[PDB]
Structure formats: C-alpha cells, structure tokens
Amino acid sequence: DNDPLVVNTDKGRIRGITVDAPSGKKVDVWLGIPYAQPPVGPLRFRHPRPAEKWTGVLNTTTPPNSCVQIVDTVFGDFPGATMWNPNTPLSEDCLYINVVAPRPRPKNAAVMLWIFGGGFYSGTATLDVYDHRALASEENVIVVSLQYRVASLGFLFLGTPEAPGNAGLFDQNLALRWVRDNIHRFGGDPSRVTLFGESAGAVSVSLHLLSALSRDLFQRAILQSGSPTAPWALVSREEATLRALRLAEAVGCPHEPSKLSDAVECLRGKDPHVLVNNEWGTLGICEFPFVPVVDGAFLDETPQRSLASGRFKKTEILTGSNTEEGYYFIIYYLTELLRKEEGVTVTREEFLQAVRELNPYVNGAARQAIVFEYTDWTEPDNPNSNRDALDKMVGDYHFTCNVNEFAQRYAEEGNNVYMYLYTHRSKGNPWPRWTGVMHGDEINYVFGEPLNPTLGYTEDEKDFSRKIMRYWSNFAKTGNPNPNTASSEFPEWPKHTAHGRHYLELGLNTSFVGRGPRLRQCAFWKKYLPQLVAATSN
Amino acid sequence: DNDPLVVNTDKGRIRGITVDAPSGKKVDVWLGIPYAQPPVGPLRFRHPRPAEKWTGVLNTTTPPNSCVQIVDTVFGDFPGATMWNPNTPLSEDCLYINVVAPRPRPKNAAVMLWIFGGGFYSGTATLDVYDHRALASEENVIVVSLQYRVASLGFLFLGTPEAPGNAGLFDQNLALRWVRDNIHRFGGDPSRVTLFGESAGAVSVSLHLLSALSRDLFQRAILQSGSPTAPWALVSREEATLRALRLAEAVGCPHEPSKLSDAVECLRGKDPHVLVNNEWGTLGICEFPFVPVVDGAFLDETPQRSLASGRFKKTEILTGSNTEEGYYFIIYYLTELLRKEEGVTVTREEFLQAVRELNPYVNGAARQAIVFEYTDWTEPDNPNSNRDALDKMVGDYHFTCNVNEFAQRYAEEGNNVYMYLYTHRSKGNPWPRWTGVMHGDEINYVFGEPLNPTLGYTEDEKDFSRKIMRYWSNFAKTGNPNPNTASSEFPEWPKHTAHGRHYLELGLNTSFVGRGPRLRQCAFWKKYLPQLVAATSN
Ligand SMILES: *[C@@H]1O[C@H](CO)[C@@H](O[C@@H]2O[C@H](CO)[C@@H](O[C@@H]3O[C@H](CO[C@H]4O[C@H](CO)[C@@H](O)[C@H](O)[C@@H]4O)[C@@H](O)[C@H](O[C@H]4O[C@H](CO)[C@@H](O)[C@H](O)[C@@H]4O)[C@@H]3O)[C@H](O)[C@H]2NC(C)=O)[C@H](O)[C@H]1NC(C)=O
Ligand SMILES: *[C@@H]1O[C@H](CO)[C@@H](O[C@@H]2O[C@H](CO)[C@@H](O[C@@H]3O[C@H](CO)[C@@H](O)[C@H](O[C@H]4O[C@H](CO)[C@@H](O)[C@H](O)[C@@H]4O)[C@@H]3O)[C@H](O)[C@H]2NC(C)=O)[C@H](O)[C@H]1NC(C)=O
Ligand SMILES: *[C@@H]1O[C@H](CO)[C@@H](O)[C@H](O)[C@H]1NC(C)=O
Ligand SMILES: *[C@@H]1O[C@H](CO)[C@@H](O)[C@H](O)[C@H]1NC(C)=O
Ligand SMILES: [Co+2]
Ligand SMILES: [Co+2]
Helix, strand or coil, X not given: CCCCCEEEECCEEEECEEEECCCCCEEEEEEEEECECCXXXXXXXXXXXXXXXXXXXEECECCCCEECCCCCCCXXXXXXXXXXXXXXXXXXXXXXXXXXXXXXXXCCEEEEEEECCCCCCCCCCCCCCCCHHHHHHHHCCEEEEECCCCCHHHHCECCCCCCECCHHHHHHHHHHHHHHHHHHHHCEEEEEEEEEEECHHHHHHHHHHHCCCCHHHCCEEEEECCCCCCCCCCCCHHHHHHHHHHHHHHHCCCCCCCCCHHHHHHHCCCCHHHHHCCCCCCCCCCCCCCCCCCCCCCCCCCHHHHHHHCCCCCCCEEEEEECECCHHHHHHCCCCCCCCCCCCCCCHHHHHHXXXXXXXXXXXXXXXXXXXXXXXXXXXXXXXXXXXXXHHHHHHHXXXXXXXXXXXXXXXXXXXXXXXXXXXXXCCCCCCHHHCCECCCCHHHHCCHHHCCCCCCCHHHHHHHHHHHHHHHHHHHHCCCCCCCCCCCCCCXXXXXXXXXXXXXXXXXXXXXXXXXXXXXXXXXXXXXXXXXXHCCC | CCCCCEEEECCEEEECEEEECCCCCEEEEEEEEECECCCCHHHCCCCCCECCCCCCEEECECCCCECXXXXXXXXXCCHHHHCCCCCCCECCCCCEEEEEEECCCCCCEEEEEXXXXXXXXXXXXXXXXXXXXXXHHHHCCEEEEECCCCCHHHHCECCCCCCECCHHHHHHHHHHHHHHHHCCCCCEEEEEEEXXXXXHHHHHHHHHHHCCCCCCCCCEEEEXXXXXXXXXXXXXXXXHHHHHHHHHHHHCCCCCCCCCHHHHHHHCCCCHHHHHCCCCCCCCCCCCXXXXXXXXXXXXXXXXXXXXXCCCCCCCEEEEEECCCCHHHHHHCCCCCCCCCCCCCCCHHHHHHHHHHHCCCCCCHHHHHHHHHCCCCCCCCCHXXXXXXXXXXXXXXXXXXXXXXXXXHHHCCCCCEEEEEECCCCCCCCCCHHHCCCCCXXXXXXXXXXXXXXXXXXXHHHHHHHHHHHHHHHHHHCCCCCCCCCCCCCCCCCCCCCCCCEEEEECCCCCCEEECCCHHHHHHHHXXXXXXXXXXXX
C-alpha cells in the first residue's frame, strides 16, 4: 500500500491521521496502538500478554483509555489539580501506545519514549501536558508514549504466581519491545531509543537501566525528578504482601497469609474502582501503597545493591531536580497547615510539630538533627523560613538527594552525566506564589507547551521551552545536550563529573553552573543521619 | 608646679616625658606609675593593697617591669612568637600604669584603657605592638594601659582567704579606680573611659561589664576576640582548687585538701619563675591552668547565669572576631601535624584523628556531629578543606561563637552593638600563608603600627590602620564608630541588632556587611551539640 498514514505492525495494520501542532507545523499521529491483551478477568495482576494479531485495518486515531485510578477532587475543578486527572475514559483495557512522527517523515530518526509518572497510583499518556505534537515538530524526533497499569491493578504483590508484582513495569517492558520491533516503520531507529520520564516515570526509566529484561531495549535515559533509590520507589516483599492483604480485608475479601489463592481470586472478582479506592490507609507523606518490588524476574536485587555493585547499563544520563520538590506533597498531606491560599506561613511551633509528622519513623535525637539541619539560623523563628524548611526536608529526602546519588554512581562508573536544577516559575502558575517551582513544573516546558499561543506564555518562556526542548532532544540524539557549534542562546552544560559534580541551572536569565545541588543536606540524609540512628537505636 | 609634665596624683607627684610617635607627632608619656603595693611575699596570690603615698617627685619615665610569666621558646627567635614575649625585666613588682596624652594636651578628651590578653598566663602592657603613641597622636585620645598579675601568681584559687583567686582581676579593678581618680589631671574625661582588650584582655573587659565592683568605673567597652562565655575563661571553684593542689605537688610541697593553709604557705616561699613554669601538664587545646573564677566578691555568679538574667552594664559595645582564630592555638598544641612551614595540609584520616584530640571530652556521637558539621561536602577529602576545618572547629567553639553570644545578649537587652569580622592579612606576615588572618592580627592595626615609617607596611594598610583606629576611637568618644558626616572613605557600620545580627567586614577593598558571623556553626555548638550530648549520655 502507498498510503503513508497506514502502517503494517508485526500484529496487523493500523491507520493514523495528520494533525497540526499548536505551532502551526503538522505531524502524523497514531493513537491507541494495542501492545497487549487487555489484562481483564483472570489476567488481572498478572504480567501482560502480547496482543493477538488482527484481521483488516485498525483506526488508531483516538486517544486510548487510561488505566483505572483515583481521581483528584481535593481542590475540585482547580486547573493545577485537574491537569493530572485522566482526560480519557477509565478502563482496565488501557494497554496502548501512541506514536507521533514529524512531517516530512524522517528517514531514520532518534525516538524519545515518555513514561509518565503518577506516584505509581495514577497517570495517563493522554494528558494534555504531555503533548508530542510540539516536541516532534520542533525537534524533528519520533515521540512515543506508553500506558501502563497503575495502583494495585499494576503493582499488587503477594509472592504467588497469581500476584507476582511489578505488572506495570512488565507493561512498560513489553511496550519497549514493541518499539524495537515496530518503530522503524514510522521513521524510528530501534538503536537510538531514549527513555524519559518524570517522578515515578523517571523511577521507571531508572529501573529499565537496571533491569535484565529491559537492558538492550533502549539506548539512553533522561530522568526528571526521579531515582530508584528514593524512599517511595520500592517496597519490601514482606510489606507489599501485607499491603495486599489489607486491601483484601478493606474490600471484603479473605485475608490470610496461609491461603493467598483465595485472596487473589476474590480480588479478581471485585470492581476495579472499588479496588483502587481502598488502597489508601495509614500512610505518611510521600509513601504510596502499591509500587515496584524486587520480584526476581524484572529485578532480582534492590537498586541499592545494583548501584553499589555497578550492575546497571553503561550509557549517558540526563537528570535533575526542581527547587521546591516537597511542597506539592505537603500540600495534599498535612492539609490544615499549608492551605491552598496566598501568603501561607509556618510558626516555629508548627514547624517543630511538622518534622514529627513528616518523619514519623525517627527517634527524636534524629528529629533534633533534622530540626537543626533544616532551620534558618540567621532567623530561626521566621515564618517564611520555617515554611520553606518543610519543603526542603521533604524535597531533599524523597527527591533531590536520591537523584544526586544515582547521578554520582553513574558518573563514578565512567558514564557521562548531565545534571540540572530547574528554577523557573511560570507567570501563569495557578498555585500560590509561596509554592515556588514545584514538582513536575518542568514538564510543560520539555513538551513545548509555551509554543501553544492559546496559553499566554511569555516570549521569554517560549524561548526557554525551545531551549530545554533542544537540550533534551540533542541529548537523545548525540548523548550530549550541548550543540555542536556552541551557541550563545544555548549556554554550555558541563558534565556532572564524579569529582566536580557540576550542574547547569535551568532558568530564564541564567547559565550558572553550581556543584550539587544541595550537597550538604544530601550528605546529611545519606551519611550523618544513618549513623546517628544507628548509634542512638538504644 | 608650672611644669605640665609634672602631675599631682592622690598618692604623690610624678614626672613624665615628651617623646615622638613613630609618625613624628609628639606626645607626653608617663611610664610605670605605681597603682598598688608590690604583691611580694605575704601579699602573694592575695588581692592588691593600694599604693603607699610617696615623698618628693617620682620619675615615671621608664617602662615598668612585666609580671612573672613563661617565655615562648618553642619557635626560638621567630618574630611571630617573640612579639608576645615580655620586653621588660620580669618581677613580682609589676603592678604599674602607663599614661599617654597627645599634644596639644586636650581638655577632657576620651580615655581608651588597654587590658592586654595572654590567656591569663602571659602578657605585658610594655609590648611594642601595644605602642600607645600612634593611637594618642593620631586620634587625639588619652591612651592608658595597665599591668595585672598573670598565671598562678594572679589567679591561684584554693577557697582559702590566703588564696582567694581573681587577684589579677582585682589588680585590673584597682587600676580602673586609679584612672577614675587621676585621669582628669592628665587631660582626660573620667566619664568617657572606654575599656578595650584582646583575647583574655577582652574577656577581662567583659568581666568588668559584669562585675559588681568595676560596674560604675567606666563607660563603654571594646572586645576583640573574647567574651566571658568562652570555655577557657573560667573554672569550677572545684577544679581551680585541684589545679592549685596539682601545682603545689609539682613544685614539691604539701598537696593536702585537709589543710590548704600549709600549701599556700610554701607556694609563697617558692621562686616565682619556678611556679609559672610548672603550671602546665595535662591540658587540652585552648584551656589555661589558672584563669578567673566565680569568687563571690568580684563575681558572685557564672557569666552564664549573669548573661541569662540581664545583670550587666547598659552600654554600647564594639566587639568582633578574626577569620582564622583557631590556627594559632593548633600550631602550638598538636605540633607534629600542622608544622610552622609553607603549604602544609591535612589528610581526611589525620583530620578524623584531630577532631578526637581537639575535643577530648565528647562521647563519639558528638564527634560524628563535629566531623559532619566541619567538612566541605563539595569535596570531603580535600587536604586544604580538612586543614581549614580544624581552624574553624577550634576558632568557632573557643572564640567566634562566644563573641557572637555576648554581643547578641547585649543587643536583645536593648543596647547598641557593633560587630566586626577582621579579614586582613598584612603583606609582611611572618607566619605561613595557610594560617591566614590569625588570632590577634588586628592589634597591630588598632594601635597604628603601620604608621611607623621604619616598618614595611603598604600605603593601603596605613589607610586601613587609620580607618579602624577611627572606628575604635570615635566609638570611645561618641558611642558609635561611624563618622558624623557619613563619609564615603569610611563606610557605614550598621548596628548589630538582636534580629538582624549584622557585622561589618573589616578588610582592604571591602565595605561588605554580613550577618553573624557564622551563625550556623555557632548554633551547632550553642544549641545542637549540648542537646545531643544530653540525649546520648547515660
Ligand atoms: C628624675 O630624678 C632625678 C633624681 O632622681 C632628678 O634630679 C636631677 O639630677 C641631676 C643630677 O643630680 C641634676 O643636674 C644637676 O644637679 C647637680 C648637682 O650637683 C652634683 O652633681 C653634679 C655631677 O652630676 C656635680 O655638679 C657635683 O659633683 C654634685 O655632686 C648640679 O651640678 C646642677 O646644678 C647646677 O646649676 C647651675 C646652672 O644653673 C650650675 O652653674 C652649677 O654647676 C650648679 O651646680 C644640676 O642641677 C638635675 O638638674 C636634676 N633635675 C632637676 C629638674 O633639678 C631629675 O629632676 C628627674 N629627671 C628629670 C629629667 O628632670
Ligand atoms: C475507520 O473505520 C471506519 C468504520 O469502521 C471506516 O470508515 C470507512 O471509510 C471509507 C473511506 O474513507 C468511507 O467511505 C464512504 O463510503 C460511503 C458508502 O456508503 C460513501 O457514501 C461515503 O461518501 C460520503 O462522502 C461525504 C463525507 O464527507 C458525504 O458527502 C456523504 O456522506 C457521502 O456519502 C464514503 O465514500 C466510509 O465512511 C467507511 N466505510 C466502511 C465500509 O467502513 C474505515 O475502515 C476507517 N476510516 C478511516 C478513513 O480511517
Ligand atoms: C538578568 O536579566 C535581565 C533581563 O530581564 C537583565 O537585567 C540582565 O541581562 C541580567 N541581569 C544583569 C546582568 O544585570
Ligand atoms: C576592589 O575589588 C574589585 C573586585 O570586584 C575591583 O573593582 C578592584 O580590584 C578593587 N577596587 C578598587 C577601588 O581598586
Ligand atoms: Co479479619
Ligand atoms: Co601525694
């Protein structure tokens, strides 16, 4: 056939459609290419199974279903909240891929594969924030996004072959194999596959760097605000089984560590929505109920021991954090203090109580070490300082420091690393101005949302998006974000070396290069506090 | 008399002499005016008895004896060591005063009274670095210095009335009463008497702001690198007794707690040089064998309880610290590592051993807090960082942070405080380069030594001398170091507020104003570390 919009995948034929990007430029899109058998009925919790081949031609012109998940109604129809809520119908049948190619269709181009992050409980590839149209048309790259099972439906673990765990990761893995097989027909290059994700999506990307089954399915990796060594990224096999039995109990099912086949069978019987809506029990800040676990097949050792032994892919890494990683999660947790309102502050007394609520597992001597490390000593009682203190102690421990650790290990094992610190507030930020540059703020800019003129981004912000969009893309191409010509509009990004530890600051009016970021506090969490908790355990 | 150089004191008549400052400017000087009975034999260790009235006229024209003390023979004839060594004959007969008045002799000008510091074991007002002429001639102020008993001869304590302790402080006090009684005859204003000292001398100055006795004798105070809250500035009456009995044993006499009167008797019969040369034994860094003690008369409470309540003179204060306070004391103690030579460095392993030796009293969980607080987490194993970390951990604990505490307690008691940070290296510094700005470097500049045409100070340093001489002088005049006209060559020195905590950096090409200085580390010692030691103790 001579129609370019149709493509012959290894399992059948699909038809795409030509759509114009908000930039005016046009791209070809294929939306909702099935990569697996719908994981319904007896297949729930279990690993994905390759899609059955189909007769005739399939219309891949519609954004696919998103996986069954919780919806965020906490702040109602607040744009800053609803933008992360699913914009397609919720279904168990959600395992699909989206492919976007620039026009004219490139001969053989690098492919950027987006694994979304939703803390392993939420998310969809169809979110308007992740728009491939802009990234593809502007950087001349194949942009690909996959859907993966999320929450317990994707991460329930019991130890039995009935609930093996990491089902969502296997969903991603199968989708990666699909890309190697089929991406060339779109103008892709199965050799040059760059994985990029944010938060839990970046955690995923990192696990694919570690995984045996995922090793030779991609080339490079970009990791936004995520790391496999993060406290929330994994959960012990023992806890994961208890979390599952708690879900069984809360939903009405039998809960007995003796007979687990009864639990899974009953759980496969209950409603998907009824299932996901009961996962949330007594959890502290930044801990999610159903996440990856060391299963033996996808991962046979904790990311700690994989990093320590150097057992991870040898390839280039682009990673980094935002300035206020903590605030987002403190806003949803800990809700009476830090309300969604302008000019929020924290009294010294309130701050003292907060470090107890935000680190519920430490002994007090460790708490006092936390209060000392995170208080501003020029002005200890300052209400602004004490609020920002809460952001940093959450943001460092759960995000910034883990990204640093992963970036360092990769560097000292001989790999080229490119670290960033994202310091940019959008003018049109819907959140209170004390929140600053929060978790996931960079996403709008990497996907080239400022280029959409219907959203009144400033002209400087439009240049800024194009700037980091370039860094990202030509890292995916060359393994180095810096252009070949070394331009003025694209400042130099030094390699994050094992000794130097340099990062580029990504902001409007800067080319600043620091060392870190936040090396002292990251040493506090990784070095000092562990040995203090070890000494004061009795 | 019609001879201006002759002065009628309340105990007799004295003849001075007119000489030139090194600058050329001429001043009248009175050297070795006796303010007390020579504390010899029976009067040893005891308080000073006032001067006995003398017949005729006494030629106070020769620099007085220095009190009996040890001489620094550690580095030989090295100028950096010998400048602090006594330059007049050593005698127990040493209780004298020096008065220097400018010409033309002014009608009630300000009075700047210098109390030297030598860790209460050494020092003399006769040192070439304490030359008054330049200060009097260049600032039009009456400059007064006093000799006080140092070491055991001035600070031996046994609880007995024959060894009541603080003898050296009562020496200082009696001399202050002399100045109040007589300074008008020399052309000074008795109400405008300003005390200023360095190290132990500054500690002394602070103890006069606290003391019941010295309370009303002076107006203002200047405190250079010293405060009464410093760890080395006092001892438990209980220790002091043991130190005394340890000396009594070492010198070869009865060391019996049963009767102390038998010990004091012998000590009064022993050679003074023999006494001062046997005081040193088992002592860590920055702790001196015979220092002030809470006696009931001069001080009835620890400077801690005194500062806590608010019982201290309500006056202006000009205080501060140098950048590298610790080095000097680490050069002498801990002498195998950190030799007196260029480009010395400390390995991480050596640094780990040093923190053990320099803080010999802490438990080990505290040492882990110290190694963490004093390490460059940018580059932890840096040999330069590990050497400078040694300076800072000594300099903060024994000096900078105690100055900070004192100044802050005065600020929040509603007094005008002016904090400095001296950051200047003289071009002709005899010590190695790595030492930087050490303890007592400011002295040369406050006393106007650069103005001496025979010495190799640069023209900028000569300006910098006059600048800090001005700040010092018109503080002693007005109560504020800033010029009334608010000039541009003499930058503004903001007030050290209990809230702002601003300090002025005293350096060559800087007018910079910071906060603290070094509040983060000062809070480590004053807030965090004691509560850690409390938690980890059993
Ligand atoms: C600090 O304190 C000292 C004493 O502790 C004060 O006394 C000064 O001392 C000297 C010497 O004693 C005075 O100078 C002269 O005194 C002489 C006394 O005569 C004896 O000594 C000299 C030898 O040194 C010989 O003449 C003789 O052998 C005596 O044994 C006199 O010589 C002088 O007086 C003369 O005056 C006229 C001129 O007017 C001459 O023509 C005569 O020769 C006559 O004898 C002279 O006075 C000195 O003057 C004393 N000072 C004062 C102010 O009187 C010092 O006062 C004090 N220091 C200072 C700098 O003032
Ligand atoms: C996707 O799936 C759909 C359904 O599963 C299917 O659509 C088909 O596409 C063809 C070709 O594009 C269409 O052809 C039409 O055939 C009818 C015959 O009755 C004609 O009447 C149509 O002509 C219309 O053209 C104008 C439309 O603007 C109008 O003026 C007026 O309605 C005319 O009648 C037209 O030629 C048809 O819609 C279907 N047919 C079949 C048999 O499925 C196709 O598989 C996929 N479509 C695409 C384009 O991806
Ligand atoms: C920062 O950017 C602004 C433009 O908004 C401009 O003042 C200048 O380029 C930068 N600041 C400096 C260098 O003063
Ligand atoms: C002071 O230092 C600055 C460095 O920024 C420079 O202007 C110069 O070296 C110095 N200024 C003067 C007045 O010499
Ligand atoms: Co039950
Ligand atoms: Co004995």
